[PDB]
Design a protein around this ligand. Structure first.
Ligand code: CLA
Ligand code: CLA
Ligand code: CLA
Ligand code: CLA
Ligand code: CLA
Ligand code: CLA
Ligand code: CLA
Ligand code: CLA
Ligand code: CLA
Ligand SMILES: CCCCCCCCCCCCCCCC(=O)OC[C@H](COP(=O)(O)OC[C@@H](O)CO)OC(=O)CCCCCCCCCCCCCCC
Lengths: 131, 37, 62, 739, 161, 139, 80, 30
């Protein structure tokens, strides 16, 4: 074959997380499955900035710290679109036509990522500075 | 047996021995040969 | 004309043995080009001692 | 069964005139000058020319005897120079002030200042090898005993060299004798290792224990009785630890508790000498004796019983392993190179354990506080220990090219390692990079926050702390074991985990080495550089036969320089170049281990203790807030502690300062070979052999360049010699001055 | 008086080395036994510095403001023993090492198999070859005038262009 | 003709072989007939087993289907191997032996592509083809 | 791809052809004597430039020469 | 203040645009 047959390759309980994440999933539209990614990566990214920052013990640490978290995401949706210009030159048609093989929804992935990538970010700033 | 003494490395050290052996006794004999007296 | 058992010089300037003395081995007495098989005292880079030369490429220092 | 060929090759000086008589292509004569380097590489490469698995083994069995001889010659050289050219008899009178000195210099052109004012009535080079504390431990009192050992070694040196002649040129064993590994383990555990410590227990109780217990009281070196007098006189020995009046009779009625006086479990440091209690090491080697002797009645021989290793490896196989160890016994009887790699790994790794267990449990009297020596046996055995692991990586790769067989090894563990070798390396590749970022990048973070004046932002103890909680819980539970889980131990296993300090003279034998944020930060650098040295060496073994890039790397040999500039370039694809590459990383791995060790002891552990009770250390506890940045590592360790090696001129350390420059020279010379290539230096011969042909004296052996691997090999061999001998000279002329 | 150095028989510069050589070693000799074996290694040592300095005061050395004898190679015969006379001592031995292998590699290359004879150093040839190397300041002069020292530039192997 | 699928040797393994390039461009295959049940080192890891076969194995590149044959013919004395390069995603079936006979041997009808009728110092100089599109080493 | 040229100094020894790891070279009938053979490079698009070939020609200066040219996926030996 | 405003523009924000459009030029095919 091509791959190897261990006793734990292609095991069910890890495939249940694999084929149900919002990037390998079945029916989600590429505007929406980029939201669940952007809601995911955004909420924790304001973790490291607010307890490990240049100023941590001020008014002032969660507020400024969380500007850099949305300030990181805007460099990521940039890096998503430069991947869109360079991998999808016209979204050249390929073997699967996923969101990922052939593009077709990439700036709907990109715009979907930025919604939670600002939305989930300040939600933790709500949950950290208040509550 | 003496044909082994003719080979390269044994003669590259025993002539390295007496020639270094000549410089070392003459300095113990005649110390500090800096200028031709 | 060069016969077997002669000492040459080398005008093949693309060679390692160029302008060196070679004692030839044989001539192929048929029409295959570069027939002068010239053994040398010295060995080259890739460890050969003899080479095909042309009759226009060997001399008769003798 | 012992089967022998009698005199297969006789005693001839006739083959001594032909170099390369062992081989085929080199028993014809040189035509270029590389034939010398073609010769001198593959001399002791025994399966390069020999095809006979039995005859290739008989050479190895002989050559080990010769290597057994040259140590015995070298041992006698230590033992001979210990009597005549040493201040040893004076040193037993006073172990605290006088430095151990041997290798006296001849009175010639200016090296007679190296025979400095060392002490006693003596002039010589202060040595740091610890033979003085190894002979004081062994019970040596007079200088005659050191003489008779040397001739006693020299006759064993001669007996070993004759035995190598006797077993190849006279009585060559066969391969069915060689392959009996089970009977070999029975004896080597039984005879060599069982009766090793038993005989040293037979020495240490009757010889070392009386005369070293007396020197703790310290009556006199002359007034201690001779070592044979404690077997003759029954009353003289039983004055101290008086169980010898009971004789062997408690030992023969199984009432062994009557030897609670010399065969004990004291377990600390002997506070007068700072070393391990030799009573314990007598009980140690006695327990090692019975443990190894019962370890040696385990394997099968011609008496039916025993475990047979071909039976044990089979039926050690599980569902994640397929065939398991099927055929792996058949490897280690059929391949010397597979044996040498595993024998080397656990031999170097063993010696790093020796370096660790000797500074924290000092075994010898007056070795602990003599900081000249307690350092230098750490850093030597560490250095030996890394070179053997690189040799373990080499012969593991040599097994893969020349000895590994995929016919026998189907679906077993060498098959299943080779069939997932990317998952090993690429996860190893990740954990190398992860470790470099999160250990070394924590210094570059720490460099910048000190440079930018933000010490609240660096990683320190008064800062963002990275506390080693696992190494403080382990250091806790081992220091609270004497009485809870080791009740019969009086004090702990060492004073390095916890407990009070100990002093000998005015210097500290041992104190608890503490592990804070700066010790967490360096221990991951060790974990980083070891994983890279694994990654270089592991990839060399695994991809030794093929890869994706070349499918027949097994055909091109173990040591071939490149496959040319094809596929973008294939320079250094061979397994030998991986061993060549791992040598600098092992140079990098170990030299930071020494830099961790030799700095942590001087600032935190070693030092001078007051008669009030506190310790002022040497470099003054700077390892806490100084060792977290590179500039502190550069200033307060490298720049500051080298102030005594370059100011060594005019003193008896002045040979060290020359070497500290002399090794800076060779290390620079090695850069010429690593940074250059062959096809430059070949064409400089062509202009120069033109000039030697020009004046009609040209050598018939025409000169060529060095081979690329020999250009690589001389580039690393001068790199290590330039780099270690710098550290050899730095560590000497630091700790001889301040210790 | 050629580069601004006193002839240091009169110098306070060369003499301010001798005291702090002999005071360093006497302070290394004070705590010894006068009948010890290192003591003669510290009494003869100052004597080894004593024969050296009284060889330098007489030879006419030019010592600077430091007290170090500096060398002057423009070679005048007033300072000829510094470089020139150990120069002629060098070159006469250097051609003996020069011509010996030169006369050897002419004498073994004019035989059957000289490739072996670089490994084996043949005393039937090497003592024969230094016998040609002893007349080396006379042999090479009649070897260049007879032309058999060098060769023409189509005998010597030429890399291509 | 490939005969895909021909029965592959019973293997089960190898992280190192036939990855995502094979499903976008140009994978390879080699055909031979095994005259025993002997084991051989693959270019990926080592074992498969030679069947009776019909023995096909989708290797990675050209170099691995050539270096397998130089390992097959020496060890197992089988000179029947018939390499390929695939259909739709590949270029030319039956890349070796291109003539039906082994092209290390000489055979009538072949073409002398890439012959220069000179010596290599007899090539023109690159000072002589300045701003000229003729290749220096080409006839 | 790389350019592989075969010069007329070939002695039909077949060493080169049996050295190529990707089967780029072959021996072809020569017409100057109709008995010897010369090497040819019909598949230079597969030449990786390893230069194993040139290491097999016995003649004092190569009959086959490899001049590195445009690099491609095939020539770089990528399994990926 | 130019020193407090221009150096993120030309240290970050203008390098964010040119290194984008450099990379954008690189992978383009006809
Ligand atoms: C030369 C250009 C440049 C400039 C002006 C800065 C400036 C800064 N860097 Mg530095 N940095 C740079 C290059 C630069 N960097 C480079 C080239 C490297 C790699 C070596 C670094 C590595 C580095 C690290 C590791 C860190 C910094 C940090 C910082 C900040 C410290 C003060 C602060 O956080 O206030 C507190 C205020 C905030 C955290 C919020 C300020 C506004 C944020 C940045 C943007 C908010 C979103 C905004 C609307 C849109 C995104 C902006 C983007 C498009 C430009 C300061 C903004 C630290 C930091 O805090 O990161 C954020 C920090 O940890 N830098
Ligand atoms: C026993 C250890 C040993 C050591 C330290 C050496 C060391 C050396 N040998 Mg070697 N060699 C050895 C064993 C050893 N050899 C043996 C046992 C033989 C067979 C008798 C040789 C046969 C040999 C030859 C033919 C040559 C050397 C040469 C050399 C020298 C390398 C170049 C040079 O510096 O001059 C070096 C000193 C080369 C040399 O120049 O000799 C002076 C050289 O040409 N050796
Ligand atoms: C091979 C080179 C070499 C040469 C040419 C010399 C030459 C000399 N030696 Mg020396 N020597 C050498 C190596 C050499 N030695 C070595 C290797 C040793 C150690 C065994 C010695 C140990 C030695 C001693 C103990 C003595 C000499 C002495 C002498 C001198 C007188 C010879 C004699 O037998 O009386 C003579 C200048 C004698 C001398 O004049 O010393 C002051 C003398 O007493 N030699
Ligand atoms: C390459 C540069 C160089 C030069 C020009 C010199 C020159 C000298 N050195 Mg120095 N030295 C050098 C490199 C050099 N050395 C190196 C590399 C070292 C480390 C090993 C030393 C370490 C050193 C020491 C320890 C001593 C010298 C001494 C000397 C003096 C030699 C006195 C003598 O015995 O001649 C007399 C000459 C003969 C009797 C005939 C020579 C016969 C030989 C064997 C011919 C060789 C042919 C084969 C001479 C001024 C001595 C001195 O007095 O310093 C001023 C001295 O004690 N040198
Ligand atoms: C382990 C290897 C070893 C090494 C590196 C040395 C090194 C040395 N020995 Mg020692 N020696 C050794 C083993 C060794 N020895 C053994 C096993 C014996 C008992 C036979 C001796 C007996 C011995 C004596 C009696 C003396 C030395 C001396 C020396 C020093 C001068 C060299 C010399 O005399 O050789 C001689 C040169 C050759 C054999 C080359 C020809 C040198 C430090 C001398 C010394 O220490 O002076 C202070 C000295 O007097 N050695
Ligand atoms: C019980 C007696 C006995 C003792 C004291 C030893 C001791 C030794 N053997 Mg061992 N050996 C033994 C029984 C013993 N053997 C038996 C019965 C066999 C055959 C099954 C071997 C087969 C053997 C081999 C093949 C080798 C040793 C070797 C060694 C030496 C290892 C070097 C060292 O660490 O010190 C050591 C002297 C090594 C050695 O030095 O060989 C010369 C070695 O290569 N032994
Ligand atoms: C079982 C391991 C072991 C240990 C820890 C010791 C410890 C000691 N030995 Mg002893 N010895 C042993 C076995 C051991 N011995 C054996 C098997 C022999 C015969 C070869 C000897 C022969 C011997 C002599 C002749 C002398 C000593 C001396 C000493 C003391 C000096 C320090 C030292 O040697 O480094 C410590 C060494 C190690 C930590 C490495 C142990 C190496 C063995 C082979 C490990 C065996 C594997 C074991 C089952 C598992 C442990 C693995 C790893 C943790 C080590 C020290 C108490 C000297 C002394 O008397 O000092 C006063 C001394 O002169 N030993
Ligand atoms: C393995 C080497 C070894 C050797 C050769 C000896 C030899 C000896 N022992 Mg010793 N002994 C040893 C190990 C050894 N012992 C060990 C490992 C222990 C600890 C269990 C002892 C504890 C011991 C005691 C208590 C006594 C001896 C005694 C003796 C002597 C008379 C025993 C006899 O021959 O019957 C004899 C010289 C007797 C003796 O003479 O003691 C001074 C005696 O009373 N031994
Ligand atoms: C000091 C010089 C130096 C440095 C920095 C490196 C670095 C590395 N070597 Mg190399 N190596 C060196 C000398 C060096 N080597 C030499 C002299 C040799 C010849 C023997 C080699 C031979 C060698 C081999 C054989 C191997 C390595 C490997 C590695 C990598 C190991 C994994 C790692 O730590 O990644 C993390 C990277 C670092 C720790 C580098 C420092 C990065 C800093 C701390 C962070 C960056 C700051 C900032 C973000 C930078 C950008 C700022 C800007 C954009 C504004 C690492 C990149 C191995 C490898 O590739 O494994 C995967 C490997 O196998 N090296
Ligand atoms: C680690 C636990 C472990 O060793 O599991 C044990 C497992 C092998 O267990 P089995 O009982 O299947 O194997 C038996 C043989 O290993 C020896 O009898 O090893 C693997 O799965 C590979 C380990 C590397 C796995 C990388 C993680």
């Amino acid at each position: 074959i091509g791959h190897l047959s261990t006793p734990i390759s292609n095991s069910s309980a890890v495939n249940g997380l694999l084929a149900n994440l919002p990037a390998y999933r079945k029916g989600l539209t590429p505007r929406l499955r980029g939201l669940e990614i952007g809601m995911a990566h955004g909420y924790f990214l304001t973790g490291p900035f607010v307890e490990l920052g240049p100023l941590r013990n001020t008014d002032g640490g969660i507020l400024y710290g969380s500007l850099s978290a949305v300030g990181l995401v805007v460099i990521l949706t940039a890096c998503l679109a430069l991947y869109g210009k360079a991998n999808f030159s016209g979204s050249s048609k390929s073997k699967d036509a996923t969101l990922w093989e052939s593009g077709e929804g990439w700036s709907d992935f990109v715009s979907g990522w930025l919604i939670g990538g600002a939305g989930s970010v300040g939600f933790a700033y709500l949950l950290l500075q208040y509550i | 047996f003496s044909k082994y003494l003719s080979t390269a490395p044994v003669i590259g050290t025993l002539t390295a021995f007496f020639l270094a052996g000549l410089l070392i006794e003459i300095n113990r004999f005649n110390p500090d040969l800096l200028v031709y007296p | 004309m060069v016969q077997r058992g002669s000492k040459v010089r080398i005008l093949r300037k693309e060679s390692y043995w160029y302008q060196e003395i070679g004692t030839v081995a044989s001539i192929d007495q048929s029409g295959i080009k570069y027939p002068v098989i010239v053994r040398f005292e010295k060995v080259n880079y890739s460890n050969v001692n003899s080479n095909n030369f042309s009759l226009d490429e060997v001399v008769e220092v003798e | 069964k012992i089967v022998i060929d009698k005199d297969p090759v006789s005693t001839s000086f006739d083959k001594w005139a032909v170099p390369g008589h062992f081989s085929r292509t080199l028993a014809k004569g040189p035509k270029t000058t590389t034939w010398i380097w073609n010769l001198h590489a593959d001399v002791h490469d025994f399966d390069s020319y020999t095809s006979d698995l039995e005859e290739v083994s008989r050479k190895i069995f002989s050559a080990h005897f010769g290597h057994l001889a040259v140590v015995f010659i070298w041992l006698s050289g230590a033992y001979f120079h210990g009597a005549r050219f040493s201040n040893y008899e004076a040193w037993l009178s006073n172990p605290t002030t006088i430095k151990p000195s041997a290798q006296v210099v001849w009175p010639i052109v200016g090296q007679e200042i190296l025979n400095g004012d060392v002490g006693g009535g003596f002039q010589g080079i202060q040595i740091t090898s610890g033979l003085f504390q190894m002979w004081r431990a062994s019970g040596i009192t007079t200088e005659l005993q050191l003489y008779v050992t040397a001739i006693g070694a020299l006759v064993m040196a001669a007996l070993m060299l004759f035995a190598g002649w006797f077993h190849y040129h006279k009585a060559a064993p066969k391969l069915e004798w060689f392959q009996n590994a089970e009977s070999m383990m029975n004896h080597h555990l039984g005879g060599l290792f069982g009766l090793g410590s038993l005989s040293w227990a037979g020495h240490q109780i009757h010889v070392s224990l009386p005369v070293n217990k007396l020197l703790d009281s310290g009556v006199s070196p002359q007034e201690i009785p001779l070592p044979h007098e404690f077997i003759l006189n029954k009353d003289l020995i039983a004055q101290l630890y008086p169980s010898f009046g009971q004789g062997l009779t408690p030992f023969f009625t199984l009432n062994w508790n009557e030897y609670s006086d010399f065969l004990t479990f004291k377990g600390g440091l002997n506070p007068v000498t700072g070393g391990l209690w030799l009573s314990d090491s007598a009980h140690h080697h006695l327990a090692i004796a019975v443990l190894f002797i019962v370890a040696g009645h385990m394997y099968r021989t011609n008496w039916g019983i025993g475990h047979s290793m071909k039976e044990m490896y089979d039926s050690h196989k599980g569902p994640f392993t397929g065939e398991g160890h099927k055929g792996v016994y058949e490897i280690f009887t059929n391949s010397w190179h597979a044996q040498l790699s595993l024998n080397l790994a656990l031999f170097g790794s063993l010696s790093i354990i020796v370096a660790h267990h000797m500074y924290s449990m000092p075994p010898y009297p007056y070795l602990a506080t003599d900081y000249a020596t307690s350092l230098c046996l750490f850093t030597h055995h560490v250095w030996i220990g890394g070179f053997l692991i690189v040799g373990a990586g080499a012969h593991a790769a040599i097994f893969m090219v020349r000895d590994y067989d995929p016919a026998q090894n189907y679906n077993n563990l060498v098959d299943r390692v080779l069939r997932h070798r990317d998952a090993i390396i690429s996860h190893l590749n990740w954990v190398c990079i992860f470790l470099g970022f999160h250990s070394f990048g924590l210094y570059i973070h720490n460099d910048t926050m000190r440079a930018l004046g933000r010490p609240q932002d660096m990683f320190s103890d008064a800062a963002i702390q990275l506390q080693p909680v696992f190494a403080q819980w382990v250091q806790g539970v081992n220091s609270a074991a004497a009485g809870n889980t080791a009740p019969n131990a009086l004090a702990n296993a060492s004073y390095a985990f916890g407990g009070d300090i100990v002093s000998v003279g005015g210097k500290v034998a041992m104190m608890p080495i503490s592990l804070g944020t700066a010790d967490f930060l360096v221990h991951h650098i060790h974990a980083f550089t070891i994983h890279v040295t694994v990654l270089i060496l592991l990839k060399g073994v695994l991809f030794a036969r093929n890869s994706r890039l070349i499918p027949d790397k097994a055909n091109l040999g173990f040591r071939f320089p490149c496959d040319g500039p094809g596929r973008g370039g294939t320079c250094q694809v061979s397994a030998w170049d991986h061993v060549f590459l791992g040598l600098f990383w092992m140079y990098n791995s170990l030299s930071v281990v020494l830099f961790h060790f030799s700095w942590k002891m001087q600032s935190d552990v070693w030092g001078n203790v007051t008669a009030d009770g506190a310790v002022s250390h040497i470099t003054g506890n700077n390892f806490a807030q100084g060792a977290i940045t590179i500039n502190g590592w550069l200033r307060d360790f490298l720049w500051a502690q080298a102030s005594q090696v370059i100011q060594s001129y005019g003193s008896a350390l002045s040979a060290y300062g020359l070497m500290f420059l002399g090794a800076h020279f060779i290390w620079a010379f090695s850069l010429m070979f690593l940074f250059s290539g062959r096809g430059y230096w070949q064409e400089l011969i062509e202009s120069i052999v033109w000039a030697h042909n020009k004046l009609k004296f040209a050598p018939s052996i025409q000169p060529r360049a060095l081979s690329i691997t020999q250009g690589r090999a001389v580039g690393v061999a001068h790199y290590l010699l330039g780099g270690i001998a710098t550290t050899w000279s730095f560590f000497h002329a630091r700790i001889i001055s301040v210790g | 008086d050629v580069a601004g150095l006193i002839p240091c028989s009169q110098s306070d510069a060369f003499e301010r080395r001798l005291k702090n050589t002999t005071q360093r070693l006497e302070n290394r000799l004070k705590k010894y036994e006068p009948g010890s074996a290192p003591a003669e290694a510290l009494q003869k040592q100052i004597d080894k510095t004593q024969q050296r300095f009284d060889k330098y005061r007489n030879s006419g050395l030019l010592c600077g403001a430091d007290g170090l004898p500096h060398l002057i190679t423009d070679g005048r015969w007033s300072h000829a023993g510094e470089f020139t006379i150990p120069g002629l001592l060098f070159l006469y031995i250097a051609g003996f090492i020069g011509w010996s292998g030169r006369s050897y590699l002419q004498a073994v290359a004019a035989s059957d198999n000289s490739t072996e004879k670089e490994i084996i150093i043949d005393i039937p040839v090497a003592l024969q070859s230094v016998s040609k190397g002893f007349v080396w300041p006379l042999a090479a002069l009649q070897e260049f005038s007879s032309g058999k020292l060098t060769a023409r530039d189509e005998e010597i192997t030429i890399s291509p262009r | 003709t490939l005969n895909l699928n021909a029965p592959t040797p019973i293997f089960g393994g190898s992280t190192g072989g036939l990855l995502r390039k094979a499903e976008v461009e140009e994978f390879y295959s080699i055909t031979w007939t095994g005259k025993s049940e002997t084991v051989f080192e693959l270019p990926t890891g080592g074992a498969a087993i030679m069947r009776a076969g019909e023995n096909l194995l989708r290797l990675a590149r050209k170099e691995q289907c050539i270096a397998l044959g130089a390992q097959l013919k020496d060890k197992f004395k089988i000179t029947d191997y018939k390499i390929y390069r695939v259909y739709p995603s590949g270029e030319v079936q039956f890349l070796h032996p291109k003539d039906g006979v082994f092209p290390e041997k000489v055979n009538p009808g072949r073409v002398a592509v890439g012959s220069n009728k000179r010596r290599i110092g007899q090539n023109p100089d690159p000072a002589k083809l300045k701003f000229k599109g003729q290749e220096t080493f080409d006839s | 791809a790389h350019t592989v040229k075969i010069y007329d100094t070939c002695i039909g020894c077949t060493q080169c052809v049996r050295a190529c790891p990707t089967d780029v070279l072959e021996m072809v009938p020569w017409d100057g004597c109709r008995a010897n053979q010369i090497a040819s490079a019909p598949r230079t698009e597969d030449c990786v430039g390893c230069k194993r070939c040139e290491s097999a020609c016995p003649t004092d200066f190569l009959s086959i020469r490899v001049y590195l040219g445009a690099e491609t996926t095939r020539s770089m030996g990528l399994g990926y | 203040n130019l020193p407090s405003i221009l150096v993120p523009m030309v240290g970050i924000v203008l390098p964010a645009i040119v290194m984008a459009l450099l990379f954008v030029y690189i992978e383009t095919d006809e």
